[PDB]
Design a protein around this nucleic acid. Structure first.
Lengths: 189, 322, 146, 71
RNA sequence: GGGCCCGUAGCUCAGUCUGGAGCGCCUGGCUUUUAACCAGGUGGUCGAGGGUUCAAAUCCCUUCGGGCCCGCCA
């Protein structure tokens, strides 16, 4: 859903829900949507404690798989990264913070970052907690594939400034970059 | 009408075919390499099968008739790609006909488009070791989502090996899952567009080792894995704004996957297609068709440019047949 | 059709006898209640969620405190000597509660100033940056998570 | 260190096999072992210099056998 | 606030009775290499403190965190 145009306590908010995807089994759909709502609320809340701007959380509902969250003026990172190239740098910082503090966001895309005043990580649905650099490396790989598929024409600068931000915030970046090559190795020979 | 002879040696399924440009396949045959104890190879089977398949090709159509030879230069297993390339070059020079080395995955998409309805498809290509979603964006075929450790077919095969079901374990695991009643708790990882079936396979192995019923474990594994595939297909459909999806590859034989995709597309108001069983699995007919299509538009290929390409990508093909 | 009456009273003597008197009331430590929103949110969460406490008017306190535990919520955010926030429903019971507790009407204690924000952050472990009212509403909304 | 000589009925088929297999020979980025692949009249000669040697000889026996049988 | 249970290697569990292995990755072979397969390596001295015990992760207390339960409600 995600479209509500509602104001909780005069606070503009959009309640986002996960429409039951009937194609999958009923019980697995229930389990997946419950866990996705739990982790999204969990981490859209927790990340703020890292100084990583995001939408607000004001009410969870695991019974209905709903989360109410303060709305942010529509300006997507995917739709502005080509226009403003500094938001890629900013994504570098606000995702290197995640990596340094051992939190994984397994959907890294320029669609998962709004930019009105700062860089709001407006979804964390597939989040996780890991102390292994391999998960962080694979998440970076996912972002790499996303950036290629969307705006490969500027991949050079996009990835360059993403690494600039990652250097700026994350300190052991080189270790996970080296580990990334192990996953990049899947393509058979 | 120009006609072509294609081979297929990217995997265990040695395929040989001869196809015309009129819109029909003169001949198609496939010999699936039966796995030995876990040392022969797919390449060995290709070497000792392609001569025989080509003998039947001669019997059904004269040598001088075929105008072009194609072959699956990639992606695929190294030695098998090399065997098919060797045979392709030998036949090319012997018949004085041009050689073309074409790409396996795109070939799958074009055969699907030829045999099924006509469209520009979002092809979920799943097979023994090649799982990925592909489609036509930026005037080329480019991957969107793929496994990072193991493909769906290899996942099912390794599950069968662990549960000791004889190879192939596809239908056996499908029926055991059908029997199953409760879906065990297994990991469900969809890293954006990608998947990591290694986690699911390992967790299913551990769950079975813990004593959970085999039918329930198989049902859990199948539902989780094919739900991840369906979800990446949904994400790719949203990404590309296309109008129809196609299941392709060997694992297309699974009726549960087929019904899952069909129900998805019914809910999302999109069309699901899939090639007949004769064309789903690896075969020489698809490579023949791809080479014929490449040379139809006038894409020659020097005999020195027909190297194997183990790590071939669906974008390295200068798709120029539209 | 009557939204819950919320009023901040300062300089009011606290008497434990009120609790055993028997009545529907809630008293909140006014130094931690971020604003009127901090209690409207708790009201809505108690009304809608699955109750954690046997009493609606004590689930109000539990939600406002955020912490699920009742002992910690009481000992921390429960009303203390002086400034307090009264959550009530009716005028006659409100009049009796005002007469017993004492103090003077001044909602300004509910509002937030540097000291109040410092105390809120210190007691709710609110690290990171964000609007005070919105973020405390968030910390009170994250109760429905393991 | 070994040599493998293969003779064919005609120089035509000798060249056939040689130039259908030499492209594969030079298509390997890193070789199993040091190799030489040369055409001597109507025969093909392979020189091997290395485990890896056994794999190389088996693989090349297979390439040449497939090329021969294609006819 | 209290009772019960959990904590050991990069990951997961025996080992608590009463005094480590598997997984991951690395290396060689397996038709170099892998799809799989076979062998060697990498791995803690066991959440922390106190006491008992020659001898403890292993028995008791406190704490650190995690899960289950008991609640006493101002």
């Amino acid at each position: 859903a995600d479209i509500k145009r509602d104001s909780y306590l005069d606070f503009d908010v959009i309640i986002k829900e996960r429409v039951k995807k009937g194609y999958r089994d009923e019980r697995l759909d229930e389990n997946i949507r419950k866990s996705r709502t739990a982790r999204e609320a969990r981490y859209l809340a927790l990340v703020k404690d890292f100084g990583i701007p995001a939408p607000y959380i004001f009410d969870v509902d695991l019974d209905n798989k709903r989360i109410m969250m303060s709305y942010i003026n529509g300006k997507l990172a995917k739709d502005v990264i080509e226009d403003n190239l500094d938001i890629a740098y900013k994504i570098g910082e606000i995702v290197g913070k995640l990596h340094k503090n051992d939190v994984i966001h397994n959907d890294l895309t320029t669609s998962n970052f709004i930019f009105d005043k700062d860089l709001y990580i407006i979804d964390f649905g597939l989040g996780k907690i890991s102390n292994l650099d391999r998960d962080k490396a694979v998440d970076l790989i996912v972002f790499k594939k996303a950036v290629l598929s969307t705006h490969h024409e500027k991949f050079d600068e996009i990835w360059e400034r993403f690494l600039e931000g990652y250097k700026s915030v994350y300190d052991r970046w080189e270790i996970i970059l080296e580990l990334m090559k192990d996953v990049e190795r899947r393509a058979r020979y | 009408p120009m006609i072509c002879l294609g081979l297929e040696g990217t995997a265990e399924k040695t395929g040989v075919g001869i196809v015309t440009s009129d819109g029909e396949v003169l001949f198609n045959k496939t010999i699936m390499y039966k796995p030995p104890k876990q040392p022969r190879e797919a390449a060995d089977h290709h070497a000792e099968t392609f001569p025989k398949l080509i003998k039947e090709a001669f019997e059904v159509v004269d040598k001088n008739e075929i105008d072009l030879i194609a072959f699956s230069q990639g992606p695929g297993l190294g030695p098998s790609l090399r065997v098919t390339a060797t045979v392709a070059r030998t036949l090319s020079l012997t018949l004085k006909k041009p050689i073309i080395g074409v790409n396996h995955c795109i070939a799958h998409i074009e055969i699907g488009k030829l045999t099924t309805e006509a469209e520009d498809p979002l092809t979920l290509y799943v097979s023994g070791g090649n799982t990925q979603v592909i489609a036509y964006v930026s005037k080329k075929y480019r991957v969107f989502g793929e496994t990072l450790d193991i493909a769906v077919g290899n996942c099912l095969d390794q599950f069968a090996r662990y549960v000791n079901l004889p190879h192939p374990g596809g239908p056996y695991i499908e029926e055991l899952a059908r029997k199953g009643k409760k879906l065990v708790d297994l990991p469900y990882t969809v890293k954006g567009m990608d998947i990591a079936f290694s986690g699911l396979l390992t967790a299913a192995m551990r769950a079975y080792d813990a004593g959970e019923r085999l039918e329930d474990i198989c049902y859990s594994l199948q539902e989780y894995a094919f739900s991840m595939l369906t979800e990446i297909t949904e994400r790719a459909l949203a990404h590309t704004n296309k109008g129809e999806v196609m299941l392709v590859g060997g694992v297309a034989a699974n009726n549960r996957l087929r019904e899952m995709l069909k129900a998805m597309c019914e809910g999302q108001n999109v069309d699901f297609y899939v090639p007949p069983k004769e064309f789903c699995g690896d075969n020489g007919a698809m490579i023949a068709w791809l080479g014929l299509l490449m040379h139809k538009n006038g894409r020659w290929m020097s005999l020195d440019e027909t190297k194997i390409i183990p790590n071939y990508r669906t974008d390295m093909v200068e798709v120029n047949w539209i | 059709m009557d939204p819950m009456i919320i009023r901040g009273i300062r300089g009011a003597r606290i008497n434990n006898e009120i609790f055993n008197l028997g009545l529907k009331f809630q008293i909140l430590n006014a130094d931690v209640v971020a604003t009127k929103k901090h209690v409207l949110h708790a009201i809505n969460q108690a009304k809608t969620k699955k109750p954690i406490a046997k009493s609606f008017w004590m689930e109000i306190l539990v939600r406002a405190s955020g912490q699920r535990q009742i002992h910690e919520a009481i000992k921390i955010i429960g009303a203390k000597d002086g400034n307090v926030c009264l959550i009530c429903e009716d005028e006659e019971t409100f009049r009796k509660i005002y007469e017993l507790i004492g103090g003077e009407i001044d909602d300004s204690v509910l509002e937030i100033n540097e000291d109040k924000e410092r105390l809120i952050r210190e007691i709710f472990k609110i690290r990171g940056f964000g609007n005070v009212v919105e973020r405390v509403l968030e910390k009170i909304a994250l109760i429905e998570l393991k | 260190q070994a040599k493998i000589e293969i003779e064919f009925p005609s120089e035509d088929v000798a060249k056939v096999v040689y130039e259908a297999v030499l492209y594969e020979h030079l298509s390997v980025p890193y070789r199993r072992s040091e190799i030489d692949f040369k055409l001597e009249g109507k025969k093909i000669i392979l020189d091997i210099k290395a485990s890896a040697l056994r794999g190389t000889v088996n693989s090349y026996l297979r390439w040449i056998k497939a090329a021969i049988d294609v006819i």
